[PDB]
Amino acid sequence: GQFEVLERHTQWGLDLLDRYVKFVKERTEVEQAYAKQLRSLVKKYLPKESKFSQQQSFVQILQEVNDFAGQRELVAENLSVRVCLELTKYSQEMKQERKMHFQEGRRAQQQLENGFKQLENSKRKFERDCREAEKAAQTAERLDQDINATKADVEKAKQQAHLRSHMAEESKNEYAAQLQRFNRDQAHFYFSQMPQIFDKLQDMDERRATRLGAGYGLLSEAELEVVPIIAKCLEGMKVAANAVDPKNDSHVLIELHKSGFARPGDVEFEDFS
Amino acid sequence: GQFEVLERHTQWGLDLLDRYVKFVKERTEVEQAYAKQLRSLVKKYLPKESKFSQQQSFVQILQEVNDFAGQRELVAENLSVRVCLELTKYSQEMKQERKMHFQEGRRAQQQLENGFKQLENSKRKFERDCREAEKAAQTAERLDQDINATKADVEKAKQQAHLRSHMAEESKNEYAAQLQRFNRDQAHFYFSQMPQIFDKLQDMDERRATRLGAGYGLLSEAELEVVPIIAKCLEGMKVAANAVDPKNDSHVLIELHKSGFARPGDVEFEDFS
Numbered sequence: 001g002q003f004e005v006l007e008r009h010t011q012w013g014l015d016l017l018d019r020y021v022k023f024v025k026e027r028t029e030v031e032q033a034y035a036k037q038l039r040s041l042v043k044k045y046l047p048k049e050s051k052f053s054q055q056q057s058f059v060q061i062l063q064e065v066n067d068f069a070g071q072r073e074l075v076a077e078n079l080s081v082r083v084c085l086e087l088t089k090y091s092q093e094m095k096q097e098r099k100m101h102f103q104e105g106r107r108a109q110q111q112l113e114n115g116f117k118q119l120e121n122s123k124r125k126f127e128r129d130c131r132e133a134e135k136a137a138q139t140a141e142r143l144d145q146d147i148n149a150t151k152a153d154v155e156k157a158k159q160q161a162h163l164r165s166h167m168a169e170e171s172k173n174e175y176a177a178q179l180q181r182f183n184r185d186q187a188h189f190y191f192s193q194m195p196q197i198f199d200k201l202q203d204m205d206e207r208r209a210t211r212l213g214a215g216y217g218l219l220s221e222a223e224l225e226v227v228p229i230i231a232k233c234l235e236g237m238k239v240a241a242n243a244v245d246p247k248n249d250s251h252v253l254i255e256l257h258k259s260g261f262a263r264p265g266d267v268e269f270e271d272f273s
Numbered sequence: 274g275q276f277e278v279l280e281r282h283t284q285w286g287l288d289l290l291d292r293y294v295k296f297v298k299e300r301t302e303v304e305q306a307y308a309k310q311l312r313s314l315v316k317k318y319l320p321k322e323s324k325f326s327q328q329q330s331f332v333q334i335l336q337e338v339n340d341f342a343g344q345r346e347l348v349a350e351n352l353s354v355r356v357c358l359e360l361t362k363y364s365q366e367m368k369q370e371r372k373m374h375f376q377e378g379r380r381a382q383q384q385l386e387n388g389f390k391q392l393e394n395s396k397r398k399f400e401r402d403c404r405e406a407e408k409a410a411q412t413a414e415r416l417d418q419d420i421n422a423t424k425a426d427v428e429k430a431k432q433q434a435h436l437r438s439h440m441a442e443e444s445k446n447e448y449a450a451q452l453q454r455f456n457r458d459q460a461h462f463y464f465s466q467m468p469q470i471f472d473k474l475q476d477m478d479e480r481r482a483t484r485l486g487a488g489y490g491l492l493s494e495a496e497l498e499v500v501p502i503i504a505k506c507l508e509g510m511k512v513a514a515n516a517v518d519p520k521n522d523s524h525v526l527i528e529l530h531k532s533g534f535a536r537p538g539d540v541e542f543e544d545f546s
Contacts, residue, residue, distance in 0.1 A: 001533045001534045001535055002527065002530070002531070002533075002534045005526070005530045005533070006526075009526055012322070013327070016327055016328060016331065019318060019331075020331060022318075023314070023317075023318045023335075026314055026317075027314060027338070030307070030310045030311060030314055033306075033307075033310070034303070034306075034307040034310075037303045037306070037307075038303060041296070041299055041300060041303055044296075044299075045292060045295075045296045049285070054286070054289055054482055054485060054486075055289060057486070057489055058289065058292075058293060058489070061489060061492065062296075065300070119540065123543055126543075126545060127543070127545045130545040130546050131545075133546075168546065172546070175542075175543075176542070179540065179542055182540060183539045183540060186537065186539075186540070187539070190536050190537070202523055205519075205523065206519040206520060206523060207519075209327055209517065209519030209522060210517070210519045212327060212517065213327075213330070213514055213515070213517030213519065214514070216330055216331070216334060216510070216513060216514030216517060217511065217514035217515070219334065219510055219514070220507050220508075220510035220511045220514065221511075223507050223510075224507060234493050234496050234497060235493075237489070237492055237493035237496075238490065238493045238494075240489060241486055241487070241489030241490035241492070241493065242486070242490070244482065244483070244485065244486030244489060246478075246479040246480075246482030246483045246486065247479060249482060250475055250478065250479060253278070253279075253282055254275065257275070257278045258275070260274045260275075260278070261274045261275045262274055263463050264459065264463070266456045266459075266460070267392065267452065267455060267456060267459070269448075269449070269452055270396055270399075270400070270448075272399060272400045272403040272404075273403050273406075273441065273445070
């Protein structure tokens with residue numbers, strides 16, 4: 001009974017494993033689609049004038065957003081490897097080890113069942129043999145009481161009875177031996193054989209569970225790894241914004257252009273006379 | 274000259290403003306599409322068995338990922354407000370203030386140009402008036418030298434000359450006054466009038482530049498604001514993974530099910546005889 005339960009439960013353990021793997025695969029894809037659009041966006045507004053801080057910082061910011069997208073691709077990459085690829089391989093291993101333990105258990109059950117079939121046939125053969133001996137005893141008996149039967153009639157019927165009696169005895173002994181044989185095997189089957197199989201499944205199940213736990217961890221671990229650089233990115237944007245020097249951009253304007261500011265002097269008198 | 278340059282430059286300042294606004298709007302949309310898929314994902318694997326830590330932590334993790342999506346929506350929300358909405362309104366204000374300063378400048382140029390047209394007409398009228406006086410002087414002169422002309426011929430032609438001479442003098446004075454008038458205005462135009470307009474455009478431009486700088490800042494500021502909760506989210510996932518107690522889940526299994534583990538005893542002997 002504890003066999004069918006472990007069977008459904010260990011299968012459930014692999015199913016959950018396979019779902020987590022599936023959940024991370026999609027997380028990976030969702031993450032990548034995002035980074036993609038982030039790249040595209042940066043492409044769309046980046047320079048196809050660039051002397052003023054205003055136009056400068058905007059580039060520096062587009063740059064850090066572009067780096068940020070890089071970090072997200074890094075997470076999608078690591079998860080895809082440390083989790084999906086690895087755990088998918090590991091789920092295949094455990095799916096197989098599980099199969100092996102159950103085959104060993106089934107073989108154990110089959111060996112005992114075959115023992116039971118032996119028990120059965122010997123009991124049956126004992127029963128029928130008992131009936132014959134009884135039917136042959138009733139016959140010999142009745143003639144024995146028939147004062148008109150001959151001594152030969154009694155002798156013959158008695159022979160058949162003694163004969164069937166011995167056969168029932170022999171059949172009884174094989175039934176008995178078989179019973180003793182079966183009971184020991186069954187006892188041993190439940191005392192050590194099944195417990196030993198249960199241990200293996202408990203061991204494997206616990207290993208998958210622990211490994212599934214580490215898989216859970218890789219989800220947050222991949223995020224944590226990129227935390228520092230994402231912080232670098234954010235700072236890079238904060239400095240860029242504070243780099244915008246409005247009063248100085250003005251200075252730069254009335255500079256490269258001033259050489260064209262002509263201040264016309266007084267118009268002259270046109271004496272025609 | 275410095276007018277047309279400031280004209281193109283201040284327009285460029287508003288254009289860059291409008292591009293940043295545009296860049297953030299899309300960032301907002303890219304961010305939202307991401308959070309959406311993140312929500313959908315969590316929906317897809319969340320519970321439509323839940324007694325084992327393994328199934329537990331997975332939910333707790335799906336929960337924190339779901340919260341994470343919330344934080345991203347929060348950023349998309351804030352940017353959409355503090356940047357897009359606000360700066361779009363502000364770009365409209367500055368587009369209008371800019372228009373106003375240039376109209377004031379154009380009016381200044383038109384007033385001077387109209388002054389020049391006055392100068393011109395007076396010069397022209399002086400020139401033609403000079404020629405007449407000259408043509409009339411050559412006529413009076415020639416008759417004056419003609420010993421066969423009469424005194425009347427000379428007198429008449431001289432009258433016409435003196436007359437045209439006075440008209441040329443009067444026209445000269447109006448040309449002169451006009452010149453003095455124009456030169457002062459032009460001088461004043463370039464000394465104070467245009468400088469005063471330039472200041473206003475410099476002031477406005479610098480204000481848009483500074484404001485555009487703050488807009489740049491809101492990009493990183495919105496990220497920083499959610500940094501703490503995103504950290505909470507990551508921790509929530511790390512604990513969940515470390516909460517997976519494999520050895521204890523086993524315990525929970527051979528519990529709610531054990532009441533069904535029947536250990537069959539010895540089969541009994543069937544004495545038929």
